């Protein structure tokens, strides 16, 4: 658990990591007592009665936290990380403005806003193909009507709460783990 939450550096939204946790002593209530979590919503199971399991880790914006949920529509929910409707797990998120925010602008975190098809649940797209928005083809060269598929989050300490980084850890409960 600590190797996913207390990680030194997280991954981007489109390049969300996936940790297969097997053969473990799971203490699901070891972080519920931690009041450092601002968003904590379980969907497929009651939280207090939890006593393979995957852990998806990425960093999104402040307003994008509402999109990680079944049946949500948005830039992150359709082109970056989509959750199935019959989801069985929990979504944990907390503010990390004091970590992933340089004084001159932390442009290391990216996100995808250009894709010609919505992502399937638990789908990962690391495609750097130049998105064609116009009528004439691009042929791997960017320019007018040929934009880059990824965009950079701002992330500065003077940004609003809605535009601050939030580290999200999505737990998916798919008897090797109890």
């Amino acid at each position, epitope marked *: 658990f600590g190797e996913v939450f207390n990680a030194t550096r997280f991954a981007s939204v489109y390049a969300w990591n996936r940790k297969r946790i097997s053969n473990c002593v799971a203490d699901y209530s070891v972080l519920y007592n931690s009041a450092s979590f601002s968003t904590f919503k379980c969907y497929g199971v009651s939280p207090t009665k939890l006593n393979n399991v995957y852990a998806d880790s990425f960093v999104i914006r402040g307003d994008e936290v509402r999109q990680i949920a079944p049946g949500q529509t948005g830039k992150i929910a359709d082109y970056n990380y989509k959750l199935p409707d019959d989801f069985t797990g929990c979504v944990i998120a907390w503010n990390s403005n004091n970590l992933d925010s340089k004084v001159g602008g932390n442009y290391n975190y990216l996100y995808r*806003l250009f894709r010609k098809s919505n992502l399937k649940p638990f789908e990962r797209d690391i495609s750097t193909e130049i998105y064609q*928005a116009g009528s004439t083809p691009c042929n791997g060269v960017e*320019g*007018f009507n040929c934009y*880059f598929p990824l*965009q950079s989050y*701002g992330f*500065q300490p003077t940004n609003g709460v809605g535009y601050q980084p939030y580290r999200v850890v999505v737990l998916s409960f798919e008897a090797t783990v109890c």
Partner: single-chain antibody, 230 residues
């Protein structure tokens, strides 16, 4: 796309709120609406990129909002330092600047310009833009040339960038006589205007465009004044 800003002139006192607007003739589908601040005698300063994302060193007072055709720039608490003209820029199917709103109050990468400021008519205008802190052949960058005159405003001229090879993009207004050549050995890129007229008298700028930063001009140059006189 035609960007029409409103109001044209706004006079306020320190402490009040200035609500600026920028209406486009059609929808900016690429969502690359950028806001700039230009204090008198200086180059434009990137405030907001990509509809609402704030730039480097921009206080929380400046806030971007809007999408499609209506865009608003809301400055919460005004200071005497905010006396400047604010512009509106979009990228996508074209590269158009706004008319400008004159608001009156009652960093590691450096682009340095060089070249002559007095060119005779029917002669070539040459200006060089030295780059330090970033590579002129950067894969995620573009090197543009922009001029500013009270008759046309911020008029974008052209650009050059390097992916696998070198590519060009020129504005049809000056395409018949413009040339932008990069120099990798000196880490520069220069501007050439073949046949100049008194209409070309303006203040020219060179700026950097990062693709992941809303395709907005984030770091501008010194700003040289070229006069076409005989």
């Amino acid at each position: 796309i035609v960007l029409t800003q409103s109001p044209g002139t706004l006079s306020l006192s320190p402490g009040e709120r200035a609500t600026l607007s920028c209406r486009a003739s059609q929808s900016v589908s690429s969502t690359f609406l950028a806001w700039y601040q230009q204090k008198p005698g200086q180059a434009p300063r990137l405030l907001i990129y990509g509809a609402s994302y704030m730039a480097t060193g921009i206080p929380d007072r400046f806030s971007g909002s809007g999408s499609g055709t209506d865009f608003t720039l809301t400055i919460s608490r005004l200071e005497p330092e905010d006396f400047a003209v604010y512009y509106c820029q979009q990228y996508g199917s074209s590269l158009t600047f706004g008319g400008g709103t004159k608001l009156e109050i009652k960093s590691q990468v450096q682009l340095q310009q060089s070249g002559p400021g007095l060119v005779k008519p029917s002669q070539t205008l040459s200006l060089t833009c030295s780059i330090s802190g970033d590579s002129v052949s950067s894969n995620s960058a573009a090197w543009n040339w922009i001029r500013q005159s009270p008759s046309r405003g911020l008029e974008w001229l052209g650009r050059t960038y390097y992916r696998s090879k070198w590519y060009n993009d020129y504005a049809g207004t000056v395409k018949s006589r413009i040339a932008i050549n990069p120099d990798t050995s000196k880490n520069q890129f220069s501007l050439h205007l073949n046949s100049v007229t008194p209409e070309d008298t303006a203040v020219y700028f060179c700026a950097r465009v990062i693709s992941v930063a809303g395709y907005a001009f984030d770091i501008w140059g010194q700003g040289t004044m070229v006069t076409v006189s005989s």
